[PDB]
Design an enzyme around this catalytic site. Structure first.
Site, PDB file in Angstrom:
ATOM      1  N   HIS A 213     -34.922 -24.430  10.170  1.00 24.80           N
ATOM      2  CA  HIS A 213     -35.168 -24.120   8.852  1.00 24.80           C
ATOM      3  C   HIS A 213     -34.936 -22.683   8.208  1.00 24.80           C
ATOM      4  O   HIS A 213     -34.194 -22.740   7.436  1.00 24.80           O
ATOM      5  CB  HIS A 213     -36.724 -24.444   8.511  1.00 24.80           C
ATOM      6  CG  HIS A 213     -37.141 -24.138   6.898  1.00 24.80           C
ATOM      7  ND1 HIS A 213     -36.983 -25.139   5.987  1.00 24.80           N
ATOM      8  CD2 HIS A 213     -37.492 -22.989   6.463  1.00 24.80           C
ATOM      9  CE1 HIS A 213     -37.238 -24.578   4.744  1.00 24.80           C
ATOM     10  NE2 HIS A 213     -37.615 -23.435   5.039  1.00 24.80           N
ATOM     11  N   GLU A 214     -35.351 -21.612   9.268  1.00 25.09           N
ATOM     12  CA  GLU A 214     -35.045 -20.399   9.123  1.00 25.09           C
ATOM     13  C   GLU A 214     -33.567 -20.040   9.240  1.00 25.09           C
ATOM     14  O   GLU A 214     -33.010 -19.284   8.429  1.00 25.09           O
ATOM     15  CB  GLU A 214     -35.904 -19.597   9.855  1.00 25.09           C
ATOM     16  CG  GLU A 214     -37.470 -19.586   9.494  1.00 25.09           C
ATOM     17  CD  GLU A 214     -37.902 -19.520   7.939  1.00 25.09           C
ATOM     18  OE1 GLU A 214     -37.676 -18.625   7.490  1.00 25.09           O
ATOM     19  OE2 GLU A 214     -38.457 -20.446   7.490  1.00 25.09           O
ATOM     20  N   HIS A 217     -31.760 -20.502   6.170  1.00 19.83           N
ATOM     21  CA  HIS A 217     -31.950 -19.315   5.349  1.00 19.83           C
ATOM     22  C   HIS A 217     -31.041 -18.503   5.686  1.00 19.83           C
ATOM     23  O   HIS A 217     -30.416 -17.836   4.898  1.00 19.83           O
ATOM     24  CB  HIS A 217     -33.398 -19.041   4.975  1.00 19.83           C
ATOM     25  CG  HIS A 217     -34.168 -19.928   4.560  1.00 19.83           C
ATOM     26  ND1 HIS A 217     -34.263 -20.449   3.129  1.00 19.83           N
ATOM     27  CD2 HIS A 217     -35.916 -20.475   4.929  1.00 19.83           C
ATOM     28  CE1 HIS A 217     -35.260 -21.239   2.838  1.00 19.83           C
ATOM     29  NE2 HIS A 217     -36.013 -21.074   3.634  1.00 19.83           N
TER      30      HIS A 217
END
Length: 401
Positions: A213-214, A217
Site C-alpha cells: 500500500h505504501e 504511495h
C-alpha cells in the site's frame, strides 16, 4: 533475489551497503546505522525521530517509547522488512512495482539556470565511510521505523522551497514509516456470496499488503503524479472525508470514487508536467556534480519517464507510452490487486476502521513464509484463511489495543 545477502543488524559498517548515514535536512542529527538492501533502497531500523523536527521523541493508536530500541529488535526489524520485500517481489505485480520504483530516480530539477541539470540534495543521504569521510548518495526509497505513534504508517518526502516534487512530475526520495512487527485486525464482512466457512473472530491484515500500500504511495510520489492531498470525497456514512489518493491507492471499487472527469483532469495535468520535463532535458547542456555524464543522466530520465528520442536527440512525450506508464502506476498498482495476487483476505474497502492491533513476528518461517504469508502450506493454517484468523492462529497474534 530481491535482497541479495543476509544482513544482520550487528554487522560491521563497510561504507557501501552497511553504514552510518545522515539524512540531509535532519540537520545536526547524529548518524544512524542504515542498510542498503537494494539499488536505490535503504532501511533505517530506528524509530523515526528525524524526518520531522516537531516529532523528535516517542512521548486506534499504539505507543511504546521502548519499541525498536534494542539491537536485537533492530535486527528482527531488518529481517521482517526484508522478508516482506521478497514477498512483494515474488509476485509479478510486485516485481513490476519494485522495478518502477528503482527506475523512478527523483528528477534533477535543482538548477535555476535552465541550461543546467542539477540535483536536489534532499534526495540524497550522506554515507559515512570508515575513514570518516562522507559520500553523498542518491536514493529513491528509505524504510524507517514509526515515530511516537507506532501504528502511524505514512509516506513522506522533504519538499522544496517552491517545487511540488510529488505533484510536478519530478519526484523525491520517499521515507516510509512502517513496521513489520504489528498488523491490524479487520472483520469478516459477511456478504451473501462470501465463503460462510470462514474461521471465526477478526482476521489480521497481511503486513505485505500494508507495505505494498505504501510502496504504491511511494511510486506515485516518486513519479511526481501523486494526487493533491486536498482533493477528497465526502463519503456518506456528518460527513467523513477521504483523499482521492488513498482511494486510488486502495484501488478496487474505491478507486471509482474518482469520476471520469477527475481522471482525465489528472491525466492531462501530469502529461503536461512530463512534457515540461522532456523540454527541460532538451534545454539541458551541462550538469553539476559530475561524478556522472550528461548523456547518462538524460538517458536515466528518458528511461524513467519513457520519453521518445528522435535522431537529433530531442526528447518528447509519446501519448500512448505515457498512458501505459501512468495507468500502470495508478490503476494496476493498487492494494486490491495485491490482495488478488497474494490470495489473502483483507478489508474490502479503505473504509474499515476496526480497532485491533496485534504484535506479530513474520520473521520465523514457522509463522510466516514468503510464498504463503500466514497461510502456511503443509500446515493447517492454509485454508479458509486460517493463517489470518487471530482465533485459530492465536499464537501469531497478540492483542494490544
Amino acid at each position: 533475489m530481491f535482497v541479495n545477502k543476509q544482513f544482520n543488524y550487528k554487522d560491521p559498517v563497510n561504507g557501501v551497503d552497511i553504514a552510518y548515514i545522515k539524512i540531509p535536512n535532519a540537520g545536526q542529527m547524529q548518524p544512524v546505522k542504515a542498510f542498503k538492501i537494494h539499488n536505490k533502497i535503504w532501511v533505517i531500523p530506528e524509530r523515526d525521530t528525524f524526518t520531522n523536527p516537531e516529532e523528535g521523541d516517542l512521548n486506534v493508536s499504539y505507543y511504546d517509547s521502548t519499541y525498536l530500541s534494542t539491537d536485537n529488535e533492530k535486527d528482527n526489524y531488518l529481517k521482517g522488512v526484508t522478508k516482506l520485500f521478497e514477498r512483494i517481489y515474488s509476485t509479478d505485480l510486485g516485481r513490476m512495482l519494485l522495478t518502477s520504483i528503482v527506475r523512478g530516480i527523483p528528477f534533477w530539477g535543482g538548477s535555476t539556470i535552465d541550461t543546467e541539470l542539477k540535483v536536489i540534495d534532499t534526495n540524497c543521504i550522506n554515507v559515512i565511510q570508515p575513514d570518516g569521510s562522507y559520500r553523498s548518495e542518491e536514493l529513491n526509497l528509505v524504510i524507517i521505523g514509526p515515530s511516537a505513534d507506532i501504528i502511524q504508517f505514512e509516506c513522506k518526502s522533504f519538499g522544496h522551497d517552491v517545487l511540488n516534487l510529488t505533484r510536478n512530475g519530478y519526484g523525491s526520495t520517499q521515507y516510509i514509516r512502517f513496521s513489520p512487527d504489528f498488523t491490524f485486525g479487520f472483520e469478516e464482512s459477511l456478504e451473501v456470496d462470501t465463503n460462510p466457512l470462514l474461521g471465526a473472530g477478526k482476521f489480521a491484515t497481511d503486513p505485505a499488503v500494508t507495505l505494498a500500500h505504501e510502496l504504491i504511495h511511494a511510486e506515485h510520489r516518486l513519479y511526481g503524479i501523486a494526487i493533491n492531498p486536498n482533493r477528497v470525497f465526502k463519503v456518506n456514512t456528518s460527513g467523513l472525508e477521504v483523499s482521492f489518493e488513498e482511494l486510488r491507492t486502495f484501488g478496487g471499487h474505491d478507486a471509482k470514487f474518482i469520476d471520469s472527469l477527475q481522471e482525465n483532469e489528472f491525466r492531462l495535468y501530469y502529461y503536461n508536467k512530463f512534457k515540461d520535463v522532456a523540454s527541460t532535458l532538451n534545454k539541458a547542456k551541462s550538469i553539476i556534480g559530475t561524478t556522472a555524464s550528461l548523456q547518462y543522466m538524460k538517458n536515466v530520465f528518458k528511461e524513467k519517464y519513457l520519453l521518445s528520442e528522435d535522431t537529433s536527440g530531442k526528447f518528447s512525450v509519446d501519448k500512448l507510452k505515457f498512458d501505459k506508464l501512468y495507468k500502470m502506476l495508478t490503476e494496476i498498482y493498487t492494494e486490491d490487486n495485491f490482495v488478488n495476487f497474494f490470495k489473502v483476505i483483507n478489508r474490502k474497502t479503505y473504509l474499515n476502521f476496526d480497532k485491533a492491533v496485534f504484535r506479530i513476528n513474520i520473521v520465523p518461517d514457522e509463522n510466516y513464509t514468503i510464498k504463503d504469508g500466514f497461510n502456511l502450506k503443509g500446515a493447517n493454517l492454509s485454508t479458509n484463511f486460517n493463517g489470518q484468523n487471530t482465533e485459530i492462529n492465536s499464537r501469531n497474534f497478540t492483542r494490544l489495543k
